[PDB]
Amino acid sequence: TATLCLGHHAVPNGTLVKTITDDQIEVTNATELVQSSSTGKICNNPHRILDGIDCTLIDALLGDPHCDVFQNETWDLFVERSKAFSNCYPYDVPDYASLRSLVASSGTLEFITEGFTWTGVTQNGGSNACKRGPGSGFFSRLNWLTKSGSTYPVLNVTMPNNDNFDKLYIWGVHHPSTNQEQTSLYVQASGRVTVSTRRSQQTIIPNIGSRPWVRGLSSRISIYWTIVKPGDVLVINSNGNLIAPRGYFKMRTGKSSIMRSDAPIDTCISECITPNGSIPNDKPFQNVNKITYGACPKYVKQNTLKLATGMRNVPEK
């Protein structure tokens, strides 16, 4: 006679996995399905990464003197840093988060200057709170209009959209610290700014008073925006406190976004970006972050998941 024995391989040291019927079963091999680490750096390929160094996207949009390098810049991902700071005339943006989202998803700061004509007013006013070069200045994409001589007319300007794309207009309203400023700056006891299209309008009333001092100023500027579609018309009506647009930003649609991260950017390639740096995307899940951009693994709570890649390991003994 003869003996024919059937069997399978085993390994000296296997690994444990979980099944429906068993909490821990040893298997010959298992792989890891959760990516739990990053390189600590953001890769600059294949996506276009724009490092706002000390700028926020809104300061870059408005034209803060330290952000002059971002004029007409584009990105797939705009990266904000914790060290970013503003250094211009103090301002606020009602619904800041929406404007930040609109610009971030458009993906561009391409700006086209338009021939707005403002008559009977002094154009291009600035402040020592926004120095540009050795003297006073202002945001590069805004025009601070003030009285001319002893008057300030009601401004009524029309700017039609005869193009085949949407135009984004950024404008604002000045808020003087006192009654003695509003009548020396734009000779008006009660200003108003109205900006409208064929479908909607926004009217803003300035609010006089001292705020905490920021960069030497107790006054503020509020930022507002409007979108004009092809065939529509932009109309601006004001009797004081207008921080006029100088033109429009071209709007786009696409894959562009924004992230907050202090990670450095390097010469490597990775499709998945998290605020902790780029991660591999060769696993179905990750627990590095919830904030991701690009071709990323799904975020899960688990730090580890082991998937058997082989059979039960039963040692010889």
Next chain:
Amino acid sequence: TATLCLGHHAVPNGTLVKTITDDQIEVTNATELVQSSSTGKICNNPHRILDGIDCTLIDALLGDPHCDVFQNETWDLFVERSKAFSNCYPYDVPDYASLRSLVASSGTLEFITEGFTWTGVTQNGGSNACKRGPGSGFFSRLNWLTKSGSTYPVLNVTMPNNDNFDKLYIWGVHHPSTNQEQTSLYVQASGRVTVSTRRSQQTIIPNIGSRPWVRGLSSRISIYWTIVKPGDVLVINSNGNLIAPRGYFKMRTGKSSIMRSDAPIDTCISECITPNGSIPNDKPFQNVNKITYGACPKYVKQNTLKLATGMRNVPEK
């Protein structure tokens, strides 16, 4: 001896399905779980479908002269068309989307006229921008109040809810194009409209100025609404620019909704409506649209899913 062979059937041409262990396995039969097509038409049964032909729900609500056919109409589903247009005094609705949602879910335009008494004012003013018949007109559910003789009193009117249901009041505020209109129309340099209940109030200040011309007018009307519950009271206070309610809409709860579609409506029966037309609901999933109404299959990305309805197909060879 004898031979007894056991086996199973096979078919000349089977179909492929996916399993956990196999990417493609041939089976005798398989069914399709994703509904990927529509008839291109909306069925008028069992649901009540209201085709707004050239009307939007809001124009039907306000009383645009082309929408006079929708007075006191009801629906389970209101259908808006891409060809719909407005043709009345130009207007805007702050938070348009919420009003559209409220009315759509109520499911009715039933309107009850109330005995509001407006004294010292001229009632029923109209415009050539909203012609009704051969002459001027206005929205049928609104009352444009203007000066009487040389004055305009402050209007203070009270309308209690002694009923057992909620009342929806639609009202608005006029926005003149100029200082020379507001003092000839309702003799007032600065108008205000305040509408309130025992729980909340809304005060609107009119904004003077020219907007782009729509149907010959540079002026606008803003639409606002309030809901008065049983036991509450409606109070209206104004010193100019009031587009008064003429009564209230009766509010209801239920299955009613709204959809945007250019699909035609026909004499067929289907429980599931999508903007591409009605679809069968005999499959658990569909990929026709994400916008659905009624007893619909779940929307999935997949264009196809095959479910084996039989065993593996192994041909004789």
Next chain:
Amino acid sequence: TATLCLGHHAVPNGTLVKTITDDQIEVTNATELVQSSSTGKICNNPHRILDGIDCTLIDALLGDPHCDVFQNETWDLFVERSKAFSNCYPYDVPDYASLRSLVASSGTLEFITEGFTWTGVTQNGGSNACKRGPGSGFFSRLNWLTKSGSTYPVLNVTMPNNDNFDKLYIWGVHHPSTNQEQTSLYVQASGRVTVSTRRSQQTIIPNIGSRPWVRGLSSRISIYWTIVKPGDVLVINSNGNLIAPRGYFKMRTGKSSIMRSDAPIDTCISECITPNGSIPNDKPFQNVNKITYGACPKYVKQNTLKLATGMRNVPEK
């Protein structure tokens, strides 16, 4: 020879469960995975439960005379009752729901009085609509400022945050019923209240007019709030209608929340609270409610789910 029979146990009366291949299969034993009932009572352990008896969280926050017992109180869960009512000067809170959420999640009404100095005005005004003791009164955390003698100066007060935590300030704006009240109360034809920080500002304009009568008053107070972070500064500017803060609420982060329930509270222990009372948390699912607090089972639609805890039951016959 001999017979050796192999088999398994059976029970006289088994239970039915559902599987992938069978709609109903009898098994020896099965357990219930859906918790479908409550005790009808809320347990006061391990969580700290604060029964607002006739108070809402906002009345407790503002200082309604019936809620004086909740001063400096804390909770893990604040419980509102359907019988709760207000009994003070009539008020409204724009975005009521957000303030209710902020306070509920902070978990405390700890209040610190600050040395605000209001000069040229009369402090601590009250009303017969908010009686405290036998005479007139007001909300305990607010200061109603009115004219002094024949004047009312513009108030400009600064209160810096030099602490290491966020400060919540509650303040409001008075809305007189008439032009004959606003000039006798705070001698001003047009009041305004501006409250600001280094990052944002709020300016409120009062609205004159009669509202439905509540507790004998046709006038109203609107409630607003602001948060001042460490290093920031609170600035208040007003020329009339200011219901001043008396200090700040200390903000916290944590597990605290709010629930609406008419269930009584008792001396028992339970980690899961629903508005129908506490429930056991020894099952993975529940269908008692969707509103839960603490270590609760997941809410499902199903009233029952049976999980086999044993084998198929096949009776002897």
Next chain:
Amino acid sequence: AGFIENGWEGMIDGWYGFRHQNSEGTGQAADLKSTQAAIDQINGKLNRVIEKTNEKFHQIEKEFSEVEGRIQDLEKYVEDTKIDLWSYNAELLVALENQHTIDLTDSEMNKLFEKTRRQLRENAEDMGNGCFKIYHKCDNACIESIRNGTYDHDVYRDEALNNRF
């Protein structure tokens, strides 16, 4: 097995069955009990066992004609999240259901085989091709007795064992 080597394209009166060869020639018949059992399990599964159609009415807007900011971003996010999760559920469910259909139908075939093998006992051998070699003369009445569960192995052992050994 013979049911691994192939199926029968010539079997149309059921899903599972028998084919035979004896002194009277050849023949075929479906087994209706295993055919119906496989069918009942499948018809159940193809029905609303773990899922059903839900009826929905008023819902959020899913398409937009304007750029709005935060609320619209959240509405889109919520809808995309819902779709990804239901698309996942559809893939997993179909692959699980198909895995179970293949396994239940292969098992019904193996059950019929074991059922037959123990009826035959020692009077037949498993040839490794889904067939049993019966070691005694077994005419058409005998084959039907095996097919309907009434074969008595005790009246054949004396012949069958002589032919096997």
Next chain:
Amino acid sequence: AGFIENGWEGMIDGWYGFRHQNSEGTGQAADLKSTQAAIDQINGKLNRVIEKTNEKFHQIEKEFSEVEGRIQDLEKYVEDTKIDLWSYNAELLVALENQHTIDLTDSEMNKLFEKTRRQLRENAEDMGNGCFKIYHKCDNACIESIRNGTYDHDVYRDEALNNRF
């Protein structure tokens, strides 16, 4: 099998076991190793293997007393979406878990049967009713030897084969 024909309502000392008849009369005993194995798999499954209770605190409002418009519509939508998905997970999970419980307990029964069959080797025949016919005298000590895994088939073949053939 006999374990398909029925279970034993008279077996209370375990889940799986043996029943026998010999020259000393009849008897019964549970098999504790297969009983415990089935129990351990089940007790694991009934525990937090793929799910656990999460502790939640402040959340969105889920009930409303007023008609608000878009935000409320989105809040309701988000909550309904969550409930439909968890209700689905509960149906699929329970049906999968029950499918696995039935399959693991049927398998433990079949494992005991195969285990017994190979201990007996050629000294017994499978009668098709979950029973083995043992072809040699097998007294109560013999039956326990089979039950505890110590049966030596080599001391019985000479008798058992004479009785089988």
Next chain:
Amino acid sequence: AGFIENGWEGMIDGWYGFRHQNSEGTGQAADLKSTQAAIDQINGKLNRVIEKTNEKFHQIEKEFSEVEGRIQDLEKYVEDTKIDLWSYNAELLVALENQHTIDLTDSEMNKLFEKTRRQLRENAEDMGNGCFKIYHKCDNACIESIRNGTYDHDVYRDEALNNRF
């Protein structure tokens, strides 16, 4: 089985295979068809069978530096809901996939065993330890014939049955 008692730490040319002892001494060889079948099923499963990576771009904000009220509460709620559901899917999926891997690899081992048993027919006995006792002289050429599916049981029965009985 012998494949339950243990695996072979000495088998490195495949996953499943044969080990033998005969008159020429001992030896070992992997079975490549069952090894590859187990591998193909696993490599498929480890790939994007029921799931794939989705590419996402602009999304909602998930972290906040300020206390905002209702919108922020809803955004957080939506994200937590998404995470709990995907975390659940990951637990269930991995446990199901691991359950299927163990079951398919145990089944491939049992298939090789049954395949061998029916090639041997009556010329061998199952010893209960994953081994077949072959009752005829079977040299290295014979063992390879069994291993590659060409063993002819009809040329050995006359010897094998004399040794078995």
